[PDB]
Every structure is written in structure tokens, then in C-alpha cells.
Design a protein around this nucleic acid. Structure first.
Ligand SMILES: [Zn+2]
Ligand SMILES: [Zn+2]
Ligand SMILES: [Zn+2]
Length: 298
DNA sequence: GCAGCGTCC
DNA sequence: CGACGAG
DNA sequence: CCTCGTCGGGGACGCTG
């Protein structure tokens, strides 16, 4: 089946006095929370650096314990890159080198990939900045669907996605994946509210498997507290935002349930990205989302 | 007409 | 979002 | 030991003078 999980923040999950092993400690509590509510988490997402500063956060003892934690529970963990990881920026010599550090760190601790945000630029400039990166065996760079309004390239329609990854394949750049953030393609103007709306988009995705195979596809399962076409990114819990709140009564006619079926049939990783002000709010929200997910799964 | 910000990811 | 200091 | 203020080597958004 699918590998379902959530983003694990340091502030809302780590114990006080976690000292040198705060990321692994947070994941430990996050795995405990999964067993309590009867949804064994198979995936997770963390920041090993930043995300707003070009500094590595994870420390040595954390790197050793994180590898043991990942192996023990067999977790599919992905690292989200910092917001400064723009390899196609003008002065990007300092930027690309920092991404090289993260990719090396990911392989040391057994993290499966690194998420980078696509820019609102041409695919030629995208592949150019990507070529400046030497691959790291076992770590996939997942290019995430961005969100904007006024720019030509949003990488949310299958035409723009197919164009990008074919230029990737012609350049012969290995270890590149796709991260589909549902809240972002919605913000970029892709109606995925109904089952058919998502099914048509997801069918066009499978129709270009020869350029981006589902083995290199991961998902951010996020509802959006914004209008379709906003360019503005406001995450919300599943069936509690503008995309799927109208389908809370019949969740198997929503667009999300079609995403769950594709994630299931391809064993893709799926990460919920929820931010709330405090631990208990976040846990109440995720318990609702993962029990609903368990309904669509089991 | 444009340059500089503040806010959010 | 997370490290780091003030208190 | 704590809590809380601060501030980021990018960028999209909308706003302001
Ligand atoms: Zn992201
Ligand atoms: Zn995302
Ligand atoms: Zn987002």
C-alpha cells in the first residue's frame, strides 16, 4: 500500500531538553502518536537544515540515532530543503553547494530524498540549475509543484509537467523525482475537487509515466484554505478547506479519494503538512485526517 | 510609474 | 521553522 | 532548568510612499 505520514516539526514534537538528538526524538514521539491512534506511520518529513537560513540543523548524535530509528521502524523519511535552495538563482554558487551538503547528509542518515521548490521560470533554466548538482547514490531530488498567479510557468498542468521532465530526461540527469502538492496545483488553478476532476488529471499523469514514472513520485496531501487560482498558499486539513470541505459527507466522491487510490496502487509516499500553533491542536487535526484516511484505505 | 517593503511558505 | 541568547 | 524575541545568503504575493 501507500506510505502515509506527516511533517514533523521540531517545536511541536520534540521533548524539552532533547539536546543533541532532537530530530530523532521528535520522530520517536511522532511514531508513538501513530500507534496511539491506530495509524502506523510509514513515512515522515523533516527539515535537516533551515528552512529559512543556510545552516544545517541536524547534529552528529542526531545523525547516528536517526539512521537507527529509520531502520528500526522502516520509515520512508524525506527531507524538505530550505527556502533558499534555489539552484537556478543568479548568485547560486553558495546555494548549490549548500544543497550538496544536504544531499550528502541525507544518504548518511538514510533519508530517501530532498524536496526542492520549482521556480516560476522556464524549464531550460530549471534543468540548468539542476545540472550544477552532482547526484548522491540513494537520494532523489523531488521537484515540488509550486504556486503562483501571474507567471507563465506554474508546473501544475500535465503539459508543463511533461515538458519539464522530458527536458530532464534528454539532459540525462539521474535521481530526479516529482512531488505533487495538491494545495499548490489548486492554488495554481487546477480544480481537483471532484473525483472526476482528479481522475482526469491523474490519468494524464500516468500517461507520461515514460518521462516521470510513479516510482519517482511523492505527494503532499494538503487541502487549501484559498480559492482555485489564488497564487497564495494556505494549507488546511483534508475536507476542511476550499478543495474538499463540500465532500466531507461523501468522501469517496472527493478528488482526494482518487489521489488516495493512485497512491495506494503505486505505493507512493504521502505527506500531510499541517501547521498549528501548539501540540494539542495539531494532534486533534491529524487524528481526524488519518482516521478518515484509514476509512478510504482499510 | 516604480522602488521599497512586510508576510507567508 | 529552528537556533540562539536574554533574562 | 524555563520562556520569549529575533532573525534568516529565496521568492511569490500584495501593499505602500
Ligand atoms: Zn514544500
Ligand atoms: Zn509542500
Ligand atoms: Zn504549501
Amino acid at each position: 500500500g501507500g506510505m502515509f505520514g506527516a511533517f514533523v516539526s521540531h517545536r511541536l514534537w520534540s521533548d524539552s531538553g532533547c539536546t543533541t538528538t532532537c530530530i530523532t526524538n521528535s520522530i520517536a514521539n511522532y511514531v508513538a502518536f501513530g500507534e496511539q491512534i491506530g495509524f502506523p506511520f510509514k513515512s515522515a518529513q523533516v527539515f535537516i537544515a533551515g528552512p529559512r537560513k543556510a545552516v544545517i540543523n541536524i547534529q552528529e548524535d542526531d545523525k547516528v540515532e536517526l539512521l537507527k530509528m529509520i531502520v528500526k521502524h522502516n520509515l520512508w523519511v524525506v527531507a524538505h530543503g530550505t527556502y533558499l535552495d534555489v539552484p537556478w538563482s543568479r548568485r547560486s554558487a553558495f546555494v548549490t553547494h549548500f544543497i550538496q551538503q544536504e544531499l550528502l547528509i541525507c544518504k548518511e542518515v538514510g533519508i530517501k530524498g530532498l524536496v526542492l521548490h520549482l521556480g516560476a521560470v522556464e524549464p531550460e533554466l530549471i534543468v540548468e540549475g539542476l545540472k550544477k548538482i552532482k547526484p548522491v547514490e540513494g537520494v532523489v531530488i523531488y521537484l515540488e509543484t509550486p504556486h503562483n498567479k501571474h507567471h507563465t510557468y506554474k508546473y501544475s498542468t500535465m503539459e508543463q509537467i511533461k515538458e519539464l521532465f522530458l527536458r530532464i530526461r534528454n539532459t540525462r540527469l539521474k535521481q530526479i523525482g516529482l512531488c505533487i502538492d495538491t494545495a499548490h496545483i489548486w492554488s495554481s488553478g487546477v480544480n481537483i475537487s471532484s473525483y472526476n476532476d482528479a481522475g482526469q488529471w491523474l490519468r494524464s499523469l500516468e500517461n507520461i509515466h515514460s518521462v516521470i514514472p510513479p516510482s519517482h513520485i511523492m505527494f503532499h496531501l494538503n487541502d487549501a484554505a484559498t480559492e482555485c487560482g489564488s497564487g497564495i498558499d494556505r494549507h488546511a486539513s483534508l475536507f476542511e478547506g476550499m478543495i474538499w470541505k463540500s465532500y466531507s459527507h461523501k468522501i469517496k466522491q472527493s478528488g482526494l479519494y482518487c489521489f488516495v487510490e493512485y497512491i495506494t496502487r503505486h505505493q507512493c509516499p504521502a505527506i500531510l503538512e499541517r501547521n498549528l500553533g501548539s501540540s494539542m491542536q495539531l494532534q486533534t487535526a491529524l487524528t481526524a485526517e488519518f482516521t478518515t484516511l484509514k476509512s478510504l484505505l482499510k
